[PDB]
Ligand binder design. Structure first.
Ligand SMILES: C[C@@H](Oc1ccc(C#N)cc1)C(N)=O
Length: 460
């Protein structure tokens, strides 16, 4: 039985509005309703992995697991295995996988982050799951961010706290936050970003939604605008939105948006908004294709509609050679030429690099670089031809060209990372000097750039 080189992943996010679901929710898992929907001809084909995020979930873990598993069994005739379930307050993530994947999945991690302080600590935050699927690391974050049209900055702060403090994936990757630890990272939830138009325009907005004319609404979506200004979700992708706003509906119909201020809303307007979202970030030159992104039309227990997204995601096998794992393979090497880091920092310490990759027996520290002044005020750290030669565990190009090197640039004085990035080994050529490039981030904010050349030797 061959190991897969592709799997399909279902991502669901639903704010349940503290109400039990209806008896049938299969349309959610089938990607049926509005937006980019799944072909009918696929309905019996199970996804490999289903990741379900809920917010304002009133059910016990047991109650929801019974509904989920029984739903997927009705659709696919497959009894899914529970990979992980984690709940913080009313925020929950469930990971289910086809039974054939049970012995491909390992290193399962769960964590949560509570956002805010005092007043603002008590119901918002995130839950997450990570695991290895054969040679591929997968991370999943379900977040319920701060509500309210005038709190986009709070939401951006909630995002930064979640990506700093959520402890998933390989702890040996100590300089790297979740935005660098996974081949594929999926971040979804009730992110609570709103359509930022005047309150007086409520009925106009509703009109536009009834005509399926979303362009003038999406141009005011706070998540799109904040992402465009690099305030949040830097280097993440989102599929084009082609479904109606998923909040705020009158319960038990989808015919009505309930936007007017009420005691129950703290006297806040809830203009129709795309609160409920799915974004991803994959390592460079890994296959990832969004095959659905939409909302259901027939699940009306909540003031939110469920959102679905599905993905084709490239995976690799758990590779064994005569040599590595357990030793190096001297027919392989990774060389770096003419490399330099450009940093935004106003500080003056020496810097060194750390290289981390599962293709190495352990991480590698460089010598310190040479600081120079850039012509526009910047710090340029020159490594020239001084970087160590990296010794991969396996030299076979079928393995090595699928790997990635994580780079941290660290202060000699503090050993704190000033920037993190990733380089793909999926090169156009081996034994050839080729340009490489990654942006550098720290706490998910842009802090600089790393560029230079690479020379990769494989056994072929
Ligand atoms: C840590 C956990 O391992 C698992 C659980 C579920 C799957 C699946 N599918 C694979 C591995 C355990 N000890 O049960």
């Amino acid at each position: 039985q061959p190991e897969p080189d592709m799997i399909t992943i279902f991502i669901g996010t639903w704010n349940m509005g503290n109400a039990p679901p209806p008896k049938k929710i299969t349309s959610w898992f089938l990607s049926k309703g509005q937006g980019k929907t799944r072909d009918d001809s696929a309905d019996y084909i199970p996804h490999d992995i289903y990741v379900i995020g809920t917010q304002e979930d009133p059910l016990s873990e047991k109650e929801w697991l019974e509904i989920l598993k029984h739903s997927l069994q009705e659709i696919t005739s497959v009894t899914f295995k529970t990979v992980a379930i984690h709940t913080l307050w009313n925020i929950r993530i469930v990971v289910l996988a086809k039974p054939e994947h049970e012995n491909r999945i390992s290193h399962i991690c769960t964590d949560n982050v509570k956002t805010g302080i005092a007043n603002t600590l008590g119901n918002k935050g995130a839950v997450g799951v990570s695991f290895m699927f054969n040679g591929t690391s997968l991370g999943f974050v379900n977040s319920h961010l701060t509500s309210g049209s005038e709190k986009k900055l709070r939401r951006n702060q909630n995002y930064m706290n979640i990506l700093r403090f959520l402890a998933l994936g390989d702890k040996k990757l100590s300089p790297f936050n979740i935005t660098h630890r996974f081949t594929h990272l999926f971040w979804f939830g009730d992110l609570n970003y709103r359509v930022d138009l005047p309150t007086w325009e409520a009925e106009t907005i509703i009109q536009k939604i009834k005509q399926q004319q979303y362009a003038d609404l999406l141009s005011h979506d706070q998540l799109l605008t904040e992402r465009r200004e690099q305030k949040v979700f830097l280097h993440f992708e989102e599929e084009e939105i082609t479904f109606a706003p998923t909040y705020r509906f009158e319960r038990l119909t989808r015919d009505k948006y309930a936007y007017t201020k009420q005691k129950a809303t703290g006297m806040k307007y809830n203009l129709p908004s795309w609160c409920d979202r799915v974004l991803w970030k994959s390592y460079p030159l890994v296959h990832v294709v969004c095959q659905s992104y939409g909302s259901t039309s027939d699940i009306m227990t909540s003031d939110h509609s469920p959102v679905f997204a599905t993905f084709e995601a490239g995976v690799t096998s758990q590779f064994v050679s005569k040599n590595g794992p357990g030793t190096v393979d001297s027919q392989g090497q990774i060389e770096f030429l003419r490399c330099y880091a450009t940093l935004k920092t106003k500080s003056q310490t020496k810097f060194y690099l750390e290289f981390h990759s599962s293709c190495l027996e352990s991480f590698v520290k460089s010598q310190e670089g040479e600081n120079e002044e850039g012509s526009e005020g910047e710090l340029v750290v020159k490594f020239g031809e001084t970087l160590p030669k990296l010794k991969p565990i396996i030299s076979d190009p079928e393995y090595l060209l699928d790997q990635h090197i994580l780079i941290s640039i660290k202060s000699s004085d503090s050993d704190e990372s000033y920037g993190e990035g990733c380089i793909a080994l999926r090169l156009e050529a081996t034994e050839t000097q080729l340009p490489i490039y990654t942006p550098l981030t720290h706490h998910g904010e842009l802090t600089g750039h790393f560029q230079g050349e690479i020379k990769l030797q494989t056994s072929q």
